[PDB]
Write a protein that binds this DNA or RNA. Structure first.
Length: 114
DNA sequence: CGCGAATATATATTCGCG
DNA sequence: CGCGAATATATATTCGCG
């Protein structure tokens, strides 16, 4: 249902796909991540995941740098405050997805005949 | 005309093949 | 050492929305 993705894009200042990257990070709870591994877990292509990581890093969700032993590959870093920020977002987004499903159900229940 | 997404082209580095 | 592919990054064009 695209209306729910539009609601998340509008209200959370991040896309549903950007939210799925944070869900991936929130399930794994590692200190650092590879962008090729984000692509391996979420099949959006290289420029889409780089745009997602550029938006999310500017929104403070993770730190972003080229690797310490190789100057092309990336390290996406997650501090303890960022882990709490991500878990709090997942709680808020699941609650708001529940509210969005409930108002949809109330709009459908208006068809009370037949 | 202007914003943003899909797509192609170009920059920079490290890797694998030769 | 040199060519080409893969990684992350960034710019520009064509298309759809506004």
């Amino acid at each position: 249902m695209d209306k729910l993705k539009s609601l998340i894009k509008k209200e959370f200042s991040i896309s549903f796909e950007e939210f799925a990257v944070l869900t991936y990070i929130s399930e794994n709870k590692e200190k650092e991540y590879y962008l090729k591994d984000i692509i391996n877990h979420l099949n959006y292509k290289q420029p889409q995941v780089v745009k997602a990581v550029k938006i999310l890093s500017q929104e403070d969700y993770f730190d972003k740098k080229r690797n310490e032993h190789d100057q092309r590959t990336v390290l996406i870093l997650v501090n303890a405050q960022q882990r709490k920020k991500i878990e709090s977002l997942l709680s808020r987004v699941n609650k708001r997805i529940t509210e969005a499903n409930n108002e949809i159900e109330l709009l459908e229940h208006h068809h009370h005949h037949h």
